[PDB]
RNA sequence: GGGAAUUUUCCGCAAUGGGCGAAAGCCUGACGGAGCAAUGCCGCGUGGAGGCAGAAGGCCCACGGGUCGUGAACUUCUUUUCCCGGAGAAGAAGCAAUGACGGUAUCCGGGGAAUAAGCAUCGGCUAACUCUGUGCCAGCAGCCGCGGUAAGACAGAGGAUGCAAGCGUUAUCCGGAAUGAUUGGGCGUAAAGCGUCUGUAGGUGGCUUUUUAAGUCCGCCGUCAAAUCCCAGGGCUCAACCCUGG
């Protein structure tokens, strides 16, 4: 709700991981919810993330040019592996 | 059509077809006349209608119409042009103002006196 | 610096002011953040809500010459200190 | 900003206007011209209904069209609310009381500072008088004579319920808001609204 | 027995050998101002006889219009008649009758004094006027809904 | 594809041909929709059966008016509404079937309940 | 100078606000005022009442008359406005004094209808008509189109209509225009289905029971300045306009 989730594609760089964020919002003229995409750059000093993982972002003071976020784990998920 | 096609901006408006490009949006515009003459109108009508080839200060060479009865204009005269087109004369899309820099009011005219720049009798 | 002065808004040759707290370097018709009174010389009427005015004066707001006189006729200074 | 012209010239063609003058036309001039006119268009019928308001009250289209906006803003019976604004005009109230023989004659009395309202002079014929408002003349014998001459030199028409008269001051008083059926002119208000539908 | 008004008059031609037979086409609308609306078309060589035929053809088909206590429509409704679509809605009291020429007369002669309408299709008075009749026949009062639905009128107002 | 888009039409086409039976499909959503038309007086009766494990429902239509119908919220364009913009079809002659968090109800029942939702189809 | 076209080489720091100074005070072409312009909006005038009968005059006529026309003349009444002569502020907050505007607004007295209406249109859309002159000529016109010897469409005259200190022309934007049709259009023949098929991205997606609550709905909090718009109330003689509250 507050922060933005995203997929962590292109995690090749050192101490950094490119992240793809997705959101839906209604079109102002026609009122249809369109899936828009926007990328960001975050940092994981432990390098605990790799491509294929699910990651959450947080605001922080700027680390470099265009890298102004911090990668954290997700809060609310629905794994629920094999519940009755 | 499909709403996905609408998001492609399939629809656009139509642009203006303004009928006085020479004025550049202004209501009137000054210009010197180059060659006064007459011309035969379209086939059904028949007359020798008066016109004037004008060089406006906005960078456009055009021709106008001489409304009214009688005129004193000649080459090297300064007139004042307005809009309005004459359908009977193809190509003419402007009128001059009577009662201005050099074009004088129509002689012996009482009705519709403001459209020709003529003093009221007293 | 914050200051308590009054701006003009009305008709020509009919002055109708309102008291307001705004920055000094801002112009006369500057962006307001709290309107704390109303005044005119002709009718001589005044609302002059006191709870808002004392909030600024505690924080270093300096009234002008006439606003000092307006507050002087009121008993706000005695309760201010 | 005023008619200043002949009135029978319009009364032959327009209709009846007790507000302008109680006099009547003389001649049904010619059967020829009636044959020339003949029928009428729907726009003309809506037009002629509007012109009756221009004479019975002495009002301009700009001054009238403003009142149309106030009626449209007012909820319910925009045609009725229009007459509520015209009948409450000071120029009509001083006339319907009988203090003048003609509404133009009453408009002159208001303009030359002869009437006061609630103890204050009013120099506006278009002044809207509210309910419970007193209307008195001035102390000069000239002012008192003009109203006194109007109430004495001819018979008096029956007044409405929303107007009174105290003959000791020769004054009046507005009681409440008018009803649309107490207008002093046979009107079809709906046609007027149909005329201003474009504007 | 009541009045009528001519909505339109138009000349139609013929291409006989010798020349052309210019005869008139009269459209007449009939209304008592208290329901009883009728639309008819007539045609004749003369103007007067064409109006008379249209009057009989209009009186040949008369229909009442549902109205409310304030002389308005119970509700909005649309209709189509060929390439002629006509729109109608109720209105507030004192609003007046406002609509196109062909639509004003048939409503003005009906009795409704406060309504509004617009025609979205062809400008033909005949095709537009008939569309109004198709629009009004398909409207009803609240009471007709209650009897055909088994619910009282007050319960529907909620 | 949208089931309810087909439900509104099978009832419409039956009135154009002027038939009594419909043989409409049964689902968790349609059983709530049909239940509103019974109480509201648009349909005389409903009845359930089966031929396979699947289920169906059989309606009973009434014998110059027409049973108008219209869908509003489509898969390609969903439409929601708040409380203040709940429609009022024809001043009350019609009704709107909309889904709230507490199931589906009539717009009038939503006016009292105080909760808007997803309008799905209007009726008049 | 350019351009169709947009202002006094003014008065004052009295008020408001700003800078310096302990203070007195200094500066302030910001600001407050005046002047020019019908540029726009609003408001009031350019007279009210009566005027029997008859006459001059303009236009028209079937030559009897009709219209301009209660209009005018005439008789009384009134003076916004106009002229003359006096009185005369608020705005100033601060004991008193401190006013650019300003002898300004405003009030009293005298005189006297005396100082004040024009512009467009009258073929259909579109409210409003005849006559003379002209003869596809001169000319009108937004569209359809009028005029070639009886022109309701040109010009003149009378009359009428619609506006009114404004009236019309031109230019620019929206509306009408559902004529880019989410609301609200269409593609057999009127403009519009790729020559056809397979399929990537993308869009949408059968039924049943649970999970979560992103979207969606409800209740509270903060915020989207003021002014403007909307409702109410009040103050300028009313209105425009100004102010208070929501
Ligand atoms: Mg670094
Ligand atoms: Mg005016
Ligand atoms: Mg249309
Ligand atoms: Mg589904
Ligand atoms: Mg100063
Ligand atoms: Mg100072
Ligand atoms: Mg200096
Ligand atoms: Mg001018
Ligand atoms: Mg007179
Ligand atoms: Mg006409
Ligand atoms: Mg002309
Ligand atoms: Mg002739
Ligand atoms: Mg002419
Ligand atoms: Mg459009
Ligand atoms: Mg569409
Ligand atoms: Mg089309
Ligand atoms: Mg073809
Ligand atoms: Mg084709
Ligand atoms: Mg495929
Ligand atoms: Mg605001």
Three-state SS string over D61-99 comes to HHHHHHHHHHHHHCCCCHHHHHHHHHHCEHHHHHHHCCC
Contact C71, C21 (CB under 8 A): no
Same domain, F78 and F23: no
Q: How many domains does chain F have?
A: 2
DSSP state of D180: G
What is the rounded distance in angstroms from the CA atom of residue D100 to the CA atom of residue D146?
8
Q: Are strands B49-56 and B60-65 parallel, antiparallel or unpaired?
A: antiparallel
Instruction: Report CA dihedral (D143, D145, D151, D155) to the nearest 10 degrees.
Output: -140
What is the rounded distance in angstroms from the CA atom of residue F116 to the CA atom of residue F112?
10
Identify the residue among D41, D42, D187 best suited for mutation to test binding to E, counting E beta carbons within 10 A and taking the highest. D42
Instruction: Report CA dihedral (D118, D119, D125, D126) to the nearest 10 degrees.
Output: -40
Residues of A in contact with F78 (CB under 8 A): 33
Same domain, F35 and F71: no
CA distances to D133, E32, E88, F90, F124 from E115, in Å: 38, 18, 8, 15, 21
Beta strand spans in E45-141 (E): 62-63, 77-81, 84-90, 97-98, 115-119
Name the neighbours of A, counting chains with at least 3 Cβ pairs within 8 A: B, F
Residues of B in contact with F76 (CB under 8 A): 2-3
Dihedral sign from CA coordinates of F85, F87, F91, F92 = negative
Name the neighbours of B, counting chains with at least 3 Cβ pairs within 8 A: A, F
What's F44's domain CATH number?
Answer: 3.30.1370.30
Same domain, F93 and F106: yes
Task: State residue C8 phi and psi, 5-degree precision.
Answer: -95, 140
Same domain, F15 and F76: no
Last residue of a domain, one of F47, F66, F85: F66
Measured in Å, residue E83 CA sits from the centre of ligand 17 at: 22
Given CB atoms, is F122 within the 8 Å cutoff of chain E?
no
Residue C77 CA, nucleotide G26 C1', distance (Å)? 32
Last residue of a domain, one of F66, F81, F107: F66
Contact F5, F71 (CB under 8 A): yes
Residue A7 CA, nucleotide G213 C1', distance (Å)? 21
Same domain, F61 and F72: no
Name the neighbours of C, counting chains with at least 3 Cβ pairs within 8 A: none
Same domain, F29 and F83: no
Last residue of a domain, one of F51, F66, F81: F66
Method by which this entry was solved: cryo-EM
Measured in Å, residue D62 CA sits from the centre of ligand 3 at: 29
Q: Which helix (H) or strand (E) holds C53?
A: helix C50-57
Which strand G nucleotides have any atom less than 7 A from protein CB atoms? 2-5, 15-19, 30-34, 41-51, 62, 66-71, 77-80, 90-94, 101, 107, 109, 113, 117-122, 125-130, 136-148, 155-157, 160-165, 167-174, 178, 180-182, 185-187, 202-219, 225-226, 230-231, 236-239, 241-245
Task: State residue E144 phi and psi, 5-degree precision.
Answer: -65, -30
Same domain, F8 and F60: yes
What's F124's domain CATH number?
Answer: 3.30.1490.10
Could you count the other beta carbons within 10 Å of the beta carbon of residue A33?
12
Contact B15, B24 (CB under 8 A): no
Identify the residue among A27, A30, A31, A34 best suited for mutation to test binding to F, counting F beta carbons within 10 A and taking the highest. A31
Same domain, F46 and F90: no
Q: Which helix (H) or strand (E) holds D150?
A: helix D141-152
Pick the closest to residue F3 from F49, F47, F56 (CA basis): F56
Residues of F in contact with E64 (CB under 8 A): none
Residues of B in contact with A30 (CB under 8 A): 3, 6-7
Given CB atoms, is A30 within the 8 Å cutoff of chain B?
yes
Q: Which helix (H) or strand (E) holds A37?
A: strand A33-42
Beta strand spans in B40-105 (E): 49-56, 60-65, 78-82, 95-96
Same domain, F113 and F74: yes
Domain residues for the domain of F34 are: 1-66
Resolution (A): 3.0
- Give strand letter and number of the nucleotide nearest B27 (CA to C1'): G171
Contact D93, D129 (CB under 8 A): yes
From its phi and psi, is residue E96 left (phi > 0), alpha (psi between -120 and 50) or beta? left
Contact A72, A57 (CB under 8 A): yes
Same domain, F108 and F80: yes
Same domain, F58 and F4: yes
Same domain, F78 and F48: no
Given CB atoms, is B7 within the 8 Å cutoff of chain F?
no
Whether F contacts C, i.e. 3 or more CB pairs less than 8 A apart, is no
């Amino acid at each position: 709700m507050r922060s933005m989730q995203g997929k962590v594609i292109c995690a090749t760089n050192d101490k950094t991981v490119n992240v793809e964020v997705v959101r839906l919002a209604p079109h102002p003229k026609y009122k249809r919810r369109v899936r828009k995409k926007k990328k960001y750059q975050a940092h994981d000093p432990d390098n605990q993330f790799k491509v294929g993982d699910w990651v959450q972002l947080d605001k922080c003071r700027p680390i470099s040019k265009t890298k102004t976020f911090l990668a954290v784990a997700p809060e609310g998920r629905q794994s629920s592996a094999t519940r009755p | 059509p499909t709403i996905k096609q609408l998001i492609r901006n399939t629809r656009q408006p139509i642009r203006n077809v303004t009928k006085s490009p020479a004025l550049r949006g202004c209501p009137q515009r000054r210009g010197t006349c180059t060659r006064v003459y007459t011309i035969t109108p379209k086939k059904p009508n028949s007359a020798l209608r008066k016109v004037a080839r004008v060089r406006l200060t906005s960078g456009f060479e055009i021709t106008a119409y001489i409304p009214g009865i009688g005129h004193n204009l000649q080459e090297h005269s300064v007139v004042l042009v307005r809009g309005g087109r004459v359908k009977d004369l193809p190509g003419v899309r402007y009128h001059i103002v009577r009662g201005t820099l050099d074009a004088v009011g129509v002689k012996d005219r009482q009705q519709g006196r403001s459209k020709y720049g003529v003093k009221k009798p007293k | 610096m914050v200051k308590l002065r009054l701006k003009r808004c009305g008709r020509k040759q009919r002055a109708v002011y309102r008291i307001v707290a705004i920055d000094v370097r801002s112009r006369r018709e500057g962006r307001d953040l709290q309107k704390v009174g109303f005044y005119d010389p002709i009718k001589s009427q005044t609302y002059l809500n006191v709870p808002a005015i004392l909030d600024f004066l505690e924080k270093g707001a300096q009234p002008t010459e006439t606003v000092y006189d307006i507050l002087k006729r009121a008993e706000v200074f005695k309760e201010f200190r | 900003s005023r008619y200043r012209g002949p009135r029978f010239k319009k009364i032959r063609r327009l209709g009846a206007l007790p507000g302008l003058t109680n006099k009547r036309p003389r001649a049904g001039s010619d059967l020829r011209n009636q044959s020339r006119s003949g029928k009428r268009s729907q726009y003309r019928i809506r037009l002629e209904e509007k012109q009756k308001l221009r004479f019975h009250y002495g009002i301009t289209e700009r001054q009238l069209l403003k009142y149309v906006r106030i009626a449209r803003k007012a909820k319910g019976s925009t045609g009725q609310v229009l007459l509520q604004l015209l009948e409450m005009r000071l120029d009509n109230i001083l006339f319907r009381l009988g203090m003048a023989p003609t509404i133009p004659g009453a408009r002159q009395l208001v303009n030359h500072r002869h009437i006061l309202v609630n103890g204050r002079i009013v120099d506006i014929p278009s002044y809207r008088c509210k309910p419970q408002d007193t209307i008195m003349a001035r102390d000069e014998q000239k002012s008192i004579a003009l109203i006194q001459n109007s109430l004495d030199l001819s018979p008096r028409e029956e007044l409405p319920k929303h107007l009174t008269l105290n003959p000791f001051p020769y004054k009046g008083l507005v009681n409440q808001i008018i009803d649309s059926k107490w207008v002093g002119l046979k009107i079809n208000e709906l046609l007027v609204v149909e005329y201003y539908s474009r504007q | 027995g009541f009045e009528e008004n001519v909505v339109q008059v138009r000349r139609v031609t013929k291409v006989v050998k010798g020349g052309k037979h210019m005869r008139f086409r009269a459209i007449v609308v009939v209304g008592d101002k208290k329901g009883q609306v009728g639309v008819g078309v007539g045609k004749a060589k003369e103007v007067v006889s064409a109006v008379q035929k249209a009057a009989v053809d209009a009186r040949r088909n008369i229909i009442t219009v549902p109205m409310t206590k304030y002389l308005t429509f119970p509700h909005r409704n649309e209709a189509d008649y060929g390439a002629a679509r006509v729109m109608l809605r109720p209105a507030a009291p004192g609003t007046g009758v406002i609509a196109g020429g062909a639509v004003r007369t048939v409503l003005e002669m009906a009795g409704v004094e406060n309504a509004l309408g617009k025609q979205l299709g062809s400008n033909n008075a005949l095709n537009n006027a008939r569309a109004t009749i198709v629009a009004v026949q398909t409207m009803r009062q609240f009471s007709d809904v209650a009897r055909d639905r088994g619910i009282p009128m007050e319960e529907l107002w909620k | 594809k949208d089931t309810i888009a087909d439900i509104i039409t099978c009832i419409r086409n039956a009135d154009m041909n002027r038939k009594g039976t419909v043989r409409i499909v049964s689902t968790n959503i349609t059983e709530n929709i049909v239940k509103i038309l019974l109480r509201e007086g648009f349909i005389e009766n409903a009845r359930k059966h089966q031929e396979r494990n699947k289920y169906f429902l059989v309606l009973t239509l009434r014998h110059l008016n027409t049973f108008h119908l219209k869908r509003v919220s489509r898969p390609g364009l969903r439409i929601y509404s708040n409380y203040q913009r709940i429609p009022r079809i024809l001043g009350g002659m019609g009704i709107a079937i909309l889904s709230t968090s507490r199931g589906i109800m009539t717009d009038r029942e939503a006016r009292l309940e105080g909760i808007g939702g997803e309008i799905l189809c209007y009726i008049w």
